[PDB]
């Protein structure tokens, strides 16, 4: 494709017993996603446990993923940090590795004015040296609450080519689409994907795509063909899985599923994240069984 | 068709005269106007009818008149909720006396009540509804009451509860609710996400904007049913352009002003502390009324 | 002078949820005898929002008959509706109250301008009685800024502010901006800290059963006796800890019942009854308080 | 001795190149000591730790120890979102001879209370004996703890204090009540006096860097039952805080320290922007006021 629209998986970062990067597992996961027919990969975001990794660690993941999939699927590098300098450094690396775009979550923890938020994005676009920027809006985790006018301004900053809208507000989703007819708009909450597209999103970036991305591709197609029932059924099945992931723990639940699919060696997350309660293993293992059979 | 509450129903506004008193003629005109645009039914005495700046007798008067005007023609849901359980019980008995098809009550507000107290409140009202199904009313934005999914499941399964008015933009919960209750009558409460709400699981809706463009929402239901996503989306977008304006002008007064220009409501005022519409917005409101009448 | 320690009055009901006049009169006399500076009537504590307008007027009238000319009387005439609030303000004037008060209109969103016109209209109907601006975001849902609060307390006819907020930075900012303002601390559980921050008095639910403790804190801080001020606040907080567990208004009514002041300790539905498991503690608290004073 | 007292949350001075300005850092430390401060809280929010690398944080910790170890108490905030990164800093703090360590509840990602407790246990382990100062700050962390959870944290093996950055003075009293011997630091400077009255027996604050003596005075005044004096000092502190909120908190403090000839270049790291020039007159005059008053 010659654009950034599509269904992109937010890549997980496989670790070993020592909580260190499991390269072999990382490669298998990238290849697994490609096999599922995913349009691209969102790397180094929240889902990649980037915020509990160092700059060089995130950089190492970007390089491996590029090697594995550059030129086969689109690659978006989340380079955001609270620090502008650190974010710029990762932006330069992503450019160097040949990614198709960069992305950054609104800097968090410290309260920054909207003007400071804009300058932060501008500085990163600068270090991105040509790669388009995907503004990343996720108030739930960032705590940064933006008005519609602020979102419009951000999406219109020179160099911005897309918005990752991780919000359950579908009134605002529709308002954004109405204001920007050509904007690449990613639905950020998997559990409302179907309704998100109907409201105006023309794609999505999600962590659960890793184990059932074909289902989301299926909803996009179903909607395009006017098959509401199929779209709803697919969304219902995705939410049944989401209910479980919320019970078991999101990232660790996903890594465990990927473990039973023979993709990830050690399904651990980094501390403070704890391990999956062994009582959930049966359901998680059984889920992997279904997903593989469903393929 | 005889008793099912599924459908698209307008949350009725309450027209007042220049003295802030009930304008009976306009109330009757508004009921017929809604009936003429093919609305499935009316939700009476809710937040939209300004029930919370009305006395019990005033709410009963509206209930009775609406009943005389539309009983038998369309479905009628009486919102009898008050903070007080006893007052709610009184309105409930009157709703049954006037011949309404169902009753509804907002989660009692202001004072913090435990979940068990909310359940007993609903049970008491259901008792006084003597047969009329109860429509649970979830609206955290205004009530300040945030229910968990489990609590919502407990409420909708209480004996005598036949529907839920989900006034929430959380479409994940909407789907979870539909998944847990495959037969439940589930009303989308936020007009601005109607199309998406139906897709998530809602099987109908109740809203303030239905008063001036209810046929658009019916069109959306029709479009989705026929797999015409483009039409559904186009209709939702037009509804949202209107909603964009109402939010700027004031919701209830903006709607009344439009109805006024559509020759339905004589005086478009809401009761104080609600102020009047800022004159700078009249041109858009008049243009909208003109646009809607040509469309209808 | 409206400065002082005033009890937010509870409204006693009978077994059938109707007003219990005899207990209402008893409660008013009980407060007077324990030396309260005045009473705040018809507020949240009085269960005003589960009462009709005539019921609220009935309570105001009886209280005036019992306390007028003996202690200060503030009538909370607030309703969502301005017109209803105006009716109560005019009745308060007729009964001879010293002042009126109104919570910021709730449930429906209102612009700040609309809130100001709401207060103006009530002040007018109050026919001369000073207005006590009532700020309680936790329950009302209306969160005002310092600037807005400044505008409200400077409206003509406004004579005090009931600051029911735990933000003591803002309490200090209000005192700094208004040196002569009658500023009532609204959260009993931080009374001592509220005074240090700037409040020059208070209005509270718990004053009905231990008002002398708060009078004791005003006295202790005035004499520079921080040690005593803290002990008293701490004891007040051991009580508040319990009330939060039992249910606030019904817990206070149960205590007053065991003190033979209130005949029936019930609040109106949807408020439920007190869980029998808390009765031993409530009975023990009543005995302790009666022996203390 | 113990950890009770008035501890200034140390700012991190940078040069024109956004890099650590050791000269100004050392000067700020000594400046604080001369004010009569009881200790320093190093590497916290106020020190822009979350826009510094681990190595940069360690460097800061080491220089301060060299300047103050054995002169005043030293607490090292070593908290990061990552447990392992927090432990690295804890081990370093032990190495440089700090009196205690501290960690803000890990943020951004939603962690269960159990994971939070285990997070503190791990850091405490790596602290190798140094007491832990639990850090409660919902406003910035987004983590909301109940009183029961707070009681559990302060009773964890190895915890010796609680940094209470909350305006809830009812909860402050409840904490003191439940833990009569607990070191309790008031976290919001603008309510310092009231926090002490509610139960706090000291505090940690950013504004202490430019007027720590006023806070010590409040302690003295309350201790001597002088209410009006405590109030006037708090009012003076809040007039300052009102201005800092307008100019930007950290940069406003650095700017004041600049006119006091302590910090060479008063800039914070990006995304933080510079101070609006229209405020310089007020900030400069405030510096003068404080210098004379001192």
From Swiss-Prot, chain D:
Changing residue 45 to T: No significant change in kinetic parameters for the cleavage of Neu5Ac. CDD domains: NAL. PROSITE patterns: DHDPS_1, DHDPS_2. Its EC number is 4.1.3.3. Pfam families: DHDPS. The active site is at 135 (proton donor), 163 (schiff-base intermediate with substrate). It catalyses: aceneuramate = aldehydo-N-acetyl-D-mannosamine + pyruvate. The record marks 45, 108 as: Required to correctly position the proton donor. GO terms for cellular component: cytosol. Catalyzes the reversible aldol cleavage of N-acetylneuraminic acid (sialic acid; Neu5Ac) to form pyruvate and N-acetylmannosamine (ManNAc) via a Schiff base intermediate. Experiments show the true substrate is aceneuramate (linearized Neu5Ac), which forms spontaneously at alkaline pH. Linear aceneuramate can be provided by NanQ. Can also cleave other substrates such as N-glycollylneuraminic acid (GcNeu), but not colominic acid or 2-oxocarboxylic acids such as 2-oxohexanoic acid, 2-oxo-octanoic acid, 2-oxo-3-deoxyoctanoic acid and 2-oxononanoic acid. Homotetramer. This is N-acetylneuraminate lyase. It comes from Escherichia coli (strain K12).
């Amino acid at each position: 494709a010659t654009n950034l629209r599509g269904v992109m998986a937010a890549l997980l970062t496989p670790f070993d017993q020592q909580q260190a990067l499991d390269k072999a597992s990382l490669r298998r996961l990238v290849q697994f996603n490609i096999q599922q027919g995913i349009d691209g990969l969102y790397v180094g975001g929240s889902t990649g446990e980037a915020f509990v990794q160092s700059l060089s660690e995130r950089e190492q993941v970007l390089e491996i993923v590029a090697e594995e999939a550059k030129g086969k699927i689109k690659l978006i590098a989340h380079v955001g940090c609270v620090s502008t300098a650190e974010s710029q450094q990762l932006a330069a690396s992503a450019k160097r590795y040949g990614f198709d775009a960069v992305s950054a979550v609104t800097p968090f923890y410290y309260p920054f004015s909207f003007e400071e938020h804009c300058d932060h994005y501008r500085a990163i676009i600068d270090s991105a040296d040509g790669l388009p920027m995907v503004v990343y809006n996720i108030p739930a985790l960032s705590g940064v609450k933006l008005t519609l006018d602020q979102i419009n301004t951000l999406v219109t900053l020179p160099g911005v080519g897309a918005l990752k809208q991780t919000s359950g507000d579908l009134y605002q989703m529709e308002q954004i689409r109405r204001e920007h007819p050509d904007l690449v708009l990613y639905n950020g909450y998997d559990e409302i994907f179907a309704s998100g597209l109907l409201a105006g999103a023309d794609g999505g970036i999600g962590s659960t795509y890793n184990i059932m991305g074909w289902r989301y591709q299926g909803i996009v197609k179903a909607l395009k063909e006017g098959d509401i029932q199929t779209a709803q059924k697919l969304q219902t099945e995705c939410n049944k899985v989401i209910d479980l992931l919320i019970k078991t723990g999101w990232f660790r639940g996903l890594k465990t599923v990927l473990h039973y699919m023979d993709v990830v060696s050690v399904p651990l997350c980094r501390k403070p994240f704890g391990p999956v309660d062994e009582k959930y293993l049966p359901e998680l293992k059984a889920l992997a069984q279904q997903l593989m059979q469903e393929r």
